[PDB]
Amino acid sequence: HAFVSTLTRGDLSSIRWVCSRHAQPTCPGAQLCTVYYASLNFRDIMLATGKLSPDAIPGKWTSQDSLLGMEFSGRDASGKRVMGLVPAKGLATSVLLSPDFLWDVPSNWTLEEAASVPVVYSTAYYALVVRGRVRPGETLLIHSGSGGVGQAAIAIALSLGCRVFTTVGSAEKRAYLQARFPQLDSTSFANSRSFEQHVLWHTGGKGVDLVLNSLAEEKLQASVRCLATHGRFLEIGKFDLGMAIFLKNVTFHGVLLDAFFNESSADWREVWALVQAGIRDGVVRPLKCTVFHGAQVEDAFRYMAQGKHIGKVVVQVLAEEPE
Amino acid sequence: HAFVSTLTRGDLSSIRWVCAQLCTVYYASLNFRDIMLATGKLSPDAIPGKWTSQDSLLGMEFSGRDASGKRVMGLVPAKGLATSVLLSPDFLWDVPSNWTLEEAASVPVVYSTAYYALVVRGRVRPGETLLIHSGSGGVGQAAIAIALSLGCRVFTTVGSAEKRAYLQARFPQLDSTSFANSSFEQHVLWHTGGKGVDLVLNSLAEEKLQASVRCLATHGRFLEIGKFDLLGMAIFLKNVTFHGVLLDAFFNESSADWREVWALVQAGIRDGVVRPLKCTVFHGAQVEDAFRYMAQGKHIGKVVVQVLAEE
Ligand SMILES: Oc1cc(Cl)ccc1Oc1ccc(Cl)cc1Cl
Ligand SMILES: [Cl-]
Ligand SMILES: [Cl-]
Numbered sequence: 001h002a003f004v005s006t007l008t009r010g011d012l013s014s015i016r017w018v019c020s021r022h023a024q025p026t027c028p029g030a031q032l033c034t035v036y037y038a039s040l041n042f043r044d045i046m047l048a049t050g051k052l053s054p055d056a057i058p059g060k061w062t063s064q065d066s067l068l069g070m071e072f073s074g075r076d077a078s079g080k081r082v083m084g085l086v087p088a089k090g091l092a093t094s095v096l097l098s099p100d101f102l103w104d105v106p107s108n109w110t111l112e113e114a115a116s117v118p119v120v121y122s123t124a125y126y127a128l129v130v131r132g133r134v135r136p137g138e139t140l141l142i143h144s145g146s147g148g149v150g151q152a153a154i155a156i157a158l159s160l161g162c163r164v165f166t167t168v169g170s171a172e173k174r175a176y177l178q179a180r181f182p183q184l185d186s187t188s189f190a191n192s193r194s195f196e197q198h199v200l201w202h203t204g205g206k207g208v209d210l211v212l213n214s215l216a217e218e219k220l221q222a223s224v225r226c227l228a229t230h231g232r233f234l235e236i237g238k239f240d241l242g243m244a245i246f247l248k249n250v251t252f253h254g255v256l257l258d259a260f261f262n263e264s265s266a267d268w269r270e271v272w273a274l275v276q277a278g279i280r281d282g283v284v285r286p287l288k289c290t291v292f293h294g295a296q297v298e299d300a301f302r303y304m305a306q307g308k309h310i311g312k313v314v315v316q317v318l319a320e321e322p323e
Numbered sequence: 324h325a326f327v328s329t330l331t332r333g334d335l336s337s338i339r340w341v342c343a344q345l346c347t348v349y350y351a352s353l354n355f356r357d358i359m360l361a362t363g364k365l366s367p368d369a370i371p372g373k374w375t376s377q378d379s380l381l382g383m384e385f386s387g388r389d390a391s392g393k394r395v396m397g398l399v400p401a402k403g404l405a406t407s408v409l410l411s412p413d414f415l416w417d418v419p420s421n422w423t424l425e426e427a428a429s430v431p432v433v434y435s436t437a438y439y440a441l442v443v444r445g446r447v448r449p450g451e452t453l454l455i456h457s458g459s460g461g462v463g464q465a466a467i468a469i470a471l472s473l474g475c476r477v478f479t480t481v482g483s484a485e486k487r488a489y490l491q492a493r494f495p496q497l498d499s500t501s502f503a504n505s506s507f508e509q510h511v512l513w514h515t516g517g518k519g520v521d522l523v524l525n526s527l528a529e530e531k532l533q534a535s536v537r538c539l540a541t542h543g544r545f546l547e548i549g550k551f552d553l554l555g556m557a558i559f560l561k562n563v564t565f566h567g568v569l570l571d572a573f574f575n576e577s578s579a580d581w582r583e584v585w586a587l588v589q590a591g592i593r594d595g596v597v598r599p600l601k602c603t604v605f606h607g608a609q610v611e612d613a614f615r616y617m618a619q620g621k622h623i624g625k626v627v628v629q630v631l632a633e634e
C-alpha cells in the first residue's frame with residue numbers, strides 16, 4: 001500500500017509517495033478498491049500548502065493519516081470498473097470505503113475521465129435539487145461556470161429546464177462553455193460587458209431565483225441586487241449583511257458533502273440516486289481532464305494550484321489496462 | 324383623519340398628532356422599527372412600497388373595527404399609528420370574544436412573524452429542538468407558544484430572572500432545562516446528547532451567532548428576523564441553512580404567499596395557541612411617552628397606544 005503525503009506539513013515540495021497488505025473486509029459495509037486515477041480538489045491544495053489543518057476535516061483520523069484525495073476511479077475486488085467518493089485518503093494505491101459511495105463506470109467512459117465526476121456532480125445535485133429545490137422555469141446564476149461544480153450545475157440546471165446565467169473569468173472560458181453547452185446563448189453570459197444589471201435586464205427586472213457560489217468570487221452583495229424575492233443562495237464550503245437579505249426573504253444554504261460520510265449517512269443515497277440517474281440519462285458528463293503520472297504528483301498539485309486549467313486535474317495512480 | 328408624525332425628522336420631541344377596507348383604529352402597537360424611524364436612525368425611504376415624502380410610516384399593526392363595526396386586528400405595511408387605516412381584508416383577523424381590543428393589538432406582527440419563520444421557512448417538525456434567544460421578547464414568546472404546540476422541545480435564553488419567572492409562569496410546559504443561560508451552548512449540548520439544536524431564532528440580534536453554531540445540529544436552520552440596527556467553516560460542514568425574515572414582501576411582490584401565514588395565525592387562534600401578549604398602554608396624547616418608554620426596552624410584552632377606547 002502507498003499514499004501521497006507531505007513530509008513536512010505545509011511544504012508542497014516535500015510531497016511524495018509513502019510506500020509499505022491491507023485486508024479485504026468481509027462485512028458488506030466496507031470495501032477495498034484499487035485506485036487507477038485520483039482527482040485533485042481545491043481542499044487537497046489547502047491541506048498540502050498548510051492553509052487548512054487536517055484537524056478541521058470531520059471523521060476519525062490519526063495524526064499520521066494523510067487525508068489528501070477526495071475521489072477516485074478504478075476497480076473493485078472483482079475487477080469491475082468503479083468511481084467513488086471518499087471522505088479522505090483518495091490519493092493512494094487503494095481505498096477502503098462504503099459501497100454506498102461507489103458508482104459503476106459506463107462502458108463508453110475511460111477510467112481517466114470518470115475520476116472527474118463524483119465530487120462536482122454529487123455536490124451540484126445535492127445543492128440544486130436537495131437543498132435548492134430547483135423547479136423547471138426557474139432562473140439560476142452560476143458563478144464561475146467553467147469551474148468544476150459550475151459545469152455540473154449548468155448541466156443539471158439545463159436538464160431540469162431551468163434558464164441559466166453565468167459569470168466566467170475569461171473569453172476562453174466563455175467560449176468553452178458555449179461550445180460544451182449549445183443550449184446557452186449570448187445572454188447567458190452575464191459578465192462579458194455589471195453582471196447584476198445584465199441579469200436584471202434579462203429577468204424582467206425581477207432577478208434570479210437561485211445563486212451558486214457568490215462568496216467564492218466575492219460577488220454576494222452584487223448577487224443580492226439581482227436576486228428575486230424568496231431567492232436562494234447556494235454556497236459550497238471553501239476553506240478560504242445588508243437589509244435586502246431580510247426584505248427579500250433570502251435563504252442561504254451552506255453546502256458540503258462531508259456529513260454524508262458521517263452523521264448524515266442515512267440521507268446519502270438520495271444524492272447517490274440523483275447522480276446515478278443523471279449518468280443513465282446522459283446529463284452527467286465527464287469533465288475535461290489534465291492527467292499527470294503519479295510519479296509527477298508534485299507537478300500535478302502545483303499545476304492545480306495555479307488554477308489556470310479548464311476541467312479536472314487527475315493523477316494516474318495506475319494506468320487503465322487495454323481492453 | 325389624524326396620524327402620528329415627527330414634525331421634524333429624527334426629533335422625537337417634535338412628535339405629535341396631525342389632523343381594500345377602511346377600519347377605525349382603537350389601539351396601535353409600537354414596534355422597534357417605529358422607534359428607528361422616529362429617532363431618525365432609519366430612513367422611510369428604506370421601507371418598501373410606494374410612499375411620498377408627506378407620508379408618516381409609523382405603525383405596523385392595529386386593533387379596532389371595520390366599516391361594519393366588527394372587532395378586528397390587522398397588519399399594515401405602514402401608517403398604523405393613525406385614527407383610521409385603509410388596507411386589504413387579507414391582512415385582517417376577527418378578534419375572539421375573550422380578548423379585549425387593547426391586547427388584540429399585540430398579536431398580528433409577532434405571531435405572523437413567528438409562524439412564517441418557524442413553520443413556513445424553518446419547516447419545524449414535531450420532536451425537533453429549538454433555541455429561541457430572548458424568549459421574553461415579542462417574537463420569542465410567539466415562537467415558544469408555537470413550538471410547544473407542535474410538540475417541540477424548547478431551549479431559550481433570557482435577560483433576567485424576572486423574564487425567566489414570567490416565561491415559566493406563562494408557559495408551564497417549560498421546565499428548568501428549557502432555560503439555557505441561568506453557558507447556553509454547554510447546556511444545550513448536554514441536553515441534546517451532543518447532537519445540538521435543529522433550529523435557532525434571532526442569534527444575530529443577541530450577538531450569539533458563533534456560540535449558537537457550536538450547539539447547532541447538522542442540517543440545522545438559523546431563523547433571523549430583520550432588524551435595521553444590525554462565517555466559520557462549521558456553517559458549511561454542518562450544512563447550515565440561514566433564513567432572513569421580514570413580512571414587508573407580503574404587502575407587495577409576495578402577496579400570493581401571504582395566505583399560508585394568515586391561515587397559520589388564524590388556526591393558532593382557533594386552537595388557542597395564539598395568546599395576546601402583556602400590554603403596557605399609553606393614551607394617544609402621550610404617544611411621545613410611549614415611544615420613549617418603548618425605547619427603554621425594559622418592558623415585557625407589547626407597548627400599545629390607545630387611539631380610541633373600546634366601548
Ligand atoms: O450571518 C450568517 C449566518 C449564517 Cl448561519 C449563514 C450566513 C450568514 O450570513 C449570510 C446570510 C445570508 C446571506 Cl444571503 C449571505 C450571508 Cl454571508
Ligand atoms: Cl477548501
Ligand atoms: Cl447544452
Ligand SMILES: [Cl-]
Nearest residue numbers: 367379380381
Ligand atoms: Cl416616517
Ligand SMILES: [Cl-]
Nearest residue numbers: 494495496497
Ligand atoms: Cl405551556
Ligand code: NA
Nearest residue numbers: 355356550551
Ligand atoms: Na427595526
